[PDB]
Amino acid sequence: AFKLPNLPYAYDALEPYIDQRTMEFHHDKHHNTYVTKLNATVEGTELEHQSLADMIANLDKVPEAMRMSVRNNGGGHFNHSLFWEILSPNSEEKGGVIDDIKAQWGTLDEFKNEFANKATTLFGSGWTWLVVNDGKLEIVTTPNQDNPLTEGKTPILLFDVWEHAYYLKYQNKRPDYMTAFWNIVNWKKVDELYQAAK
Amino acid sequence: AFKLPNLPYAYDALEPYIDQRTMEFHHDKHHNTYVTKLNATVEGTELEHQSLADMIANLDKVPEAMRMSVRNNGGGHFNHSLFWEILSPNSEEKGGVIDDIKAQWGTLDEFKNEFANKATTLFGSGWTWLVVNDGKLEIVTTPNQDNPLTEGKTPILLFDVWEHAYYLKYQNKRPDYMTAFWNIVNWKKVDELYQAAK
Ligand SMILES: [Mn+2]
Ligand SMILES: [Mn+2]
């Protein structure tokens, strides 16, 4: 079966950047729902031992009647599992990935500005991503729970702009939630993922 | 220029089904933003003296540089303007439209079940609609601020499932927000719109 992972920190550990209450709802309700529904779709079938990453990367091969749940719920499970891992109460802007961001964008701020502009203009529900595409870093958006693996790119950092991720604290002020996020990136995890995918 | 309409009731009039605070944010912020952006696009142009309905119905004829905003923001303005008018502090399940719903679905409950099922399975941001299509009633969904006029169908009832419409009160429990909505449909307004579009 797929399983809800435990958070690697306390629910209040990311205050004030993400409120405690949001982490409760977001992890115990929204993420738990993606998992439950995903299992309802695949259990008792020959897909029950297939990797999430492989199914997302090859949605076209998923059977037509299971595809929407695998896309949406499987997306939801992959994307939130990664999201918890790339957040940290001890963010230090260090690693080989940071050096390569500087090299490509000039400064860390230039990267943060391109990412922020894409996150804040993303219309509706979705995610902003840093990906490796061939050897190169790039920033992309996806709608809903869509995932750049489907397009042959490897994710190493992601930011949730579904309204449930920021409404309780920030309401409509999504740019303030963007600016907050930078303080809680687990750049260490981003770097591991980056070294593996270049 | 387009104008943010006044609510036709007090901000607390839909309590306890929709909290006062949500109506403040939803109307004074989210809807106001769609209008502002809409006007930034169309003020000083041909389109400022065109009906919103006609423009959304023929998005493809909107000039390339304006089309995205007219879709998203014009959609946002149309959709929320209608939404306030189809809510009522005294919802009574009365009108000729309900007689034709019974005729097509058997009972009002069968219609409510098909509508609920479509609203609750709509993935991401969007709207669930009752429309007339060529004489017949049908229930459809759209993503984000898309609108069935664009596909040649006339809307008479709509339900906002963007998470900003329900997060403060219901958080993740969108089915409880559906069940609550039935107690606040202005079926009288739905019926006027239906009589016009038959
Ligand atoms: Mn989320
Ligand atoms: Mn809305």
Numbering used by the authors:
A (entry chain B), B (entry chain A): 2 to 199
Authors' own words:
For example, Staphylococcus aureus has a constitutive Mn-specific superoxide dismutase (herein MnSOD), which is catalytically inactive when loaded with Fe, and a second one (herein camSOD)1 that is stress-induced and cambialistic—that is it can use either Mn or Fe. This cofactor promiscuity enhances the pathogenicity of S. aureus by enabling it to survive the oxidative burst of the innate immune system while experiencing host-imposed Mn starvation. Each monomer presented the characteristic fold conserved amongst Mn/Fe-SODs, with an α-helical N-terminal domain and a C-terminal α/β domain connected by a loop. The active sites were enclosed between the two domains of each monomer, with both domains contributing ligands. As shown in Fig. 3 and as expected, the Mn ions were coordinated in a distorted trigonal bipyramidal geometry by H81, D167, and H171 in the equatorial plane, and H26 and a water molecule in the axial plane.
Preparations of S. aureus MnSOD and camSOD, shown to contain exclusively Mn by ICP-MS, were used in crystallization trials. The crystal structures of Mn(Mn)SOD and Mn(cam)SOD were determined by molecular replacement, using B. subtilis SodA as a search model, at 2.07 Å and 2.30 Å, respectively (data collection and refinement statistics are provided in Table S1, ESI†). Two molecules were found in the asymmetric unit of both protein crystals. The dimers of MnSOD and camSOD were superimposable in the protein backbone with an average root mean square deviation (RMSD) of 0.744 Å by least squares fit. Most of the differences between the structures were found in the loops connecting helical elements within the N-terminal domains. S. aureus Mn(Mn)SOD and Mn(cam)SOD can be readily distinguished by their 94 GHz field-swept echo EPR spectra. For Mn(Mn)SOD, D = –10.60 and E = 0.63 GHz, similar to E. coli Mn(Mn)SOD; for Mn(cam)SOD, D = –10.66 and E = 0.43 GHz, comparable to the R. capsulatus camSOD; and for Mn(Fe)SOD, D = –10.46 and E = 0.33 GHz, which were the same within errors as those previously obtained from simulations of the Ms = –1/2 ↔ +1/2 transition. In the S. aureus Mn(Mn)SOD, the ring plane of H26 relative to the Mn–Oδ1,Asp167 bond was 180°, while in Mn(cam)SOD it was 167°. The 94 GHz ELDOR-NMR and ENDOR of Mn(Mn)SOD and Mn(cam)SOD are remarkably similar, indicating a high-degree of structural homology even at the level of the positions of the protons in proximity to the metal ion, in particular those of the water ligand.
